[PDB]
């Protein structure tokens, strides 16, 4: 059986505007993986929402009975006609042909907000980026190309918090893995914004996805690599891994903080971790140097990606007794 | 050539554990209290305690510790404790091991060069002369056992549950420091979680790199109480380079003798853990397995 993976990734970045699925394309590749973003499944378009007094984070502005079944045929190896969500105009355009792939990822604000959809998923990641992280980034983006629209990121992260809390972040509690970002706890005065601290929260008893772990699965450590084989600059690096409980259920944290000057100190991390579901030694470190303009590109961000995205590979390979798909050259 | 390995010991229940480990037929143990150049008329006389260097025959003490490694037997003098006095010689003959315990071990230049091992025990009137003496042995000793109170209880009242820290020496050669996951960089760890239920407060390890007295060292330290079998061997397992020759001997060694004291915390630990750095020496030096305790 020709068995197609689904896979839901959760997150506000908006659709084909997050890092996390560039990444994916990289290790997955475009031929054999296609990207479904959600927004294509509003039943109120742009006028609609005003009209009723709604965000696109309300359930009441999407339609999850049509998106289940699209999602259930796609799985089930038929080919469907999608609606479009014309982002520009605001307007629901006639239908898109859909055929089923090797990989279908699902992408948007509520991937995991219907219980029906849940189950249809092999596997799913929830990004959760704090707000200053989030600010800090597009004032970085701003001042490069010269754009200075980041009041516009802080004015709808605000206004966005009843909504957001309500129906995107309990999400959290049903997502395999959450990449946590936030500020550093390794510098006083946090002036600059650049130095990240992340959380990869890997939930447990997942049967066909094994976490990773730092020494002793199960128990609690705090590391600082940095030492007689590795100078770092201050403050350097510092991992975390341990057991925690998370929504009520079973989990295992593994965390790191600070920044990768260099290769040696990617490597040297990477060599030290377990259970990354890598094919060979320096698969994460080599797969995240593909892409250094990235941001996230030389901390935990970046890092904790390229890992999501090797979990992601060993639930399809364990399903379909079968190679991924991959990127071409 | 049969070999004589030397062992300085500073700062007992030590020495009972190296008995257990070696067995008394094939260590002599020598309490260096033996070199008193001053009886305890003498030291009161000439105004200084048994800590200062001038109550004490450094050139006795070298020569007969020089012989002894060379196979020689010496006729070293005994000190008797009780009446103060310096009694008649004793007959020693050279063995597998000899060790040299008591204050001064340490302290000369050339009864250091001797040693193929050394460990310092660090646990009102004596201060200025444990100062001035006694406590700079610490930066010649490979090993030094330091012993704190608690990190793990705020506000400790009890005083009970102890920070222990094994102190190993850099560039040694025929020592390996014992280190925890990754060698040379810097750890904290607790093992109750998943597998381990402790009760509180539990146990907690921290390894790495430090500068003591002006020299590379890697610290071992555990802080807490096992309070079962079960405890210890996890700890135990985790550890790297503990010299052991099987899996679970330190676990099995400590527990030979619950009743000393240290048996459930960091201080028996790592006295045995010690002793098997000692026997490692050893058998380095030697090429040849060390003496055993019998049954």
Same mark, same amino acid.
């Given at each position: 059986?020709?068995?197609?993976?689904?896979?839901?990734?959760?997150?506000?970045?908006?659709?084909? #505007?997050?890092?996390?699925?560039?990444?994916?394309?990289?290790?997955?590749?475009?031929?054999?993986?296609? %990207?479904?973003?959600?927004?294509?499944?509003?039943?109120?378009?742009?006028? =609609?929402?005003? !009209?009723?007094?709604?965000?696109?984070?309300?359930?009441?502005?999407?339609?999850?009975?049509?998106?289940? /079944?699209?999602?259930?045929?796609?799985?089930?190896?038929? *080919?469907?006609? #999608?609606?479009?969500?014309?982002?520009?105009?605001?307007?629901?355009?006639?239908?898109? #042909?859909?055929?089923?792939?090797?990989?279908?990822?699902? !992408?948007?604000?509520?991937?995991?907000?219907?219980?029906?959809? &849940?189950?249809?998923?092999?596997?799913?990641?929830? @990004?959760?980026?704090?707000?200053? %992280?989030?600010?800090? +980034?597009?004032?970085?983006?701003?001042?490069?190309? &010269?754009?200075?629209?980041?009041?516009?990121?802080?004015?709808? $992260?605000?206004?966005?918090?009843?909504?957001?809390?309500?129906?995107?972040?309990?999400? &959290?509690?049903?997502?395999?893995?959450?990449?946590?970002?936030?500020?550093?706890?390794?510098?006083?005065?946090?002036?600059?914004?650049?130095?990240?601290?992340?959380?990869?929260?890997?939930?447990?008893?997942?049967?066909?996805?094994?976490?990773?772990?730092?020494?002793?699965? =199960?128990? *609690? $450590?705090? +590391? *600082?690599?940095?030492?007689?084989?590795? *100078?770092?600059?201050?403050?350097?690096? &510092?991992?975390?891994? =341990?057991?925690?409980?998370?929504?009520?259920? /079973?989990?295992?944290? @593994?965390? %790191?903080? =600070?920044?990768?000057?260099?290769?040696? !100190?990617?490597?040297?991390?990477?060599?030290?971790?377990? #259970?990354?579901?890598?094919?060979?030694?320096?698969?994460?470190?080599?797969?995240?140097?593909?892409?250094?303009?990235?941001?996230?590109?030389?901390?935990?961000?970046?890092?904790?990606?390229?890992?999501?995205?090797?979990?992601?590979?060993?639930?399809?390979?364990?399903?379909?007794?079968?190679?991924?798909?991959?990127?071409?050259?």
């Amino acid at each position: 059986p020709d068995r197609v993976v689904l896979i839901g990734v959760a997150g506000d970045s908006g659709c084909g #505007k997050s890092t996390f699925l560039n990444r994916l394309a990289d290790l997955f590749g475009t031929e054999l993986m296609t %990207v479904i973003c959600l927004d294509d499944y509003h039943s109120l378009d742009r006028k =609609g929402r005003k !009209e009723a007094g709604v965000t696109a984070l309300d359930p009441r502005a999407n339609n999850f009975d049509l998106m289940y /079944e699209q999602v259930k045929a796609l799985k089930n190896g038929e *080919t469907i006609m #999608k609606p479009i969500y014309n982002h520009e105009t605001g307007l629901i355009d006639p239908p898109e #042909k859909i055929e089923p792939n090797r990989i279908i990822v699902i !992408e948007g604000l509520h991937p995991l907000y219907d219980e029906r959809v &849940r189950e249809l998923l092999d596997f799913s990641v929830y @990004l959760d980026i704090d707000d200053e %992280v989030k600010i800090a +980034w597009k004032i970085q983006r701003d001042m490069a190309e &010269r754009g200075h629209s980041y009041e516009d990121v802080l004015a709808s $992260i605000e206004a966005r918090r009843p909504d957001f809390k309500a129906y995107i972040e309990p999400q &959290r509690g049903h997502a395999d893995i959450v990449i946590r970002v936030m500020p550093t706890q390794l510098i006083p005065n946090d002036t600059e914004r650049k130095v990240l601290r992340v959380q990869l929260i890997q939930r447990e008893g997942r049967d066909g996805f094994e976490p990773a772990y730092l020494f002793d699965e =199960g128990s *609690t $450590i705090q +590391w *600082t690599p940095c030492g007689r084989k590795l *100078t770092c600059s201050y403050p350097g690096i &510092r991992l975390a891994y =341990g057991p925690d409980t998370y929504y009520g259920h /079973e989990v295992s944290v @593994l965390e %790191v903080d =600070g920044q990768f000057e260099n290769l040696e !100190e990617m490597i040297y991390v990477e060599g030290h971790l377990s #259970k990354t579901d890598t094919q060979y030694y320096g698969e994460l470190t080599h797969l995240l140097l593909q892409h250094k303009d990235y941001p996230g590109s030389n901390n935990g961000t970046g890092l904790f990606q390229v890992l999501t995205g090797l979990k992601m590979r060993a639930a399809y390979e364990r399903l379909t007794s079968q190679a991924a798909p991959v990127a071409a050259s």
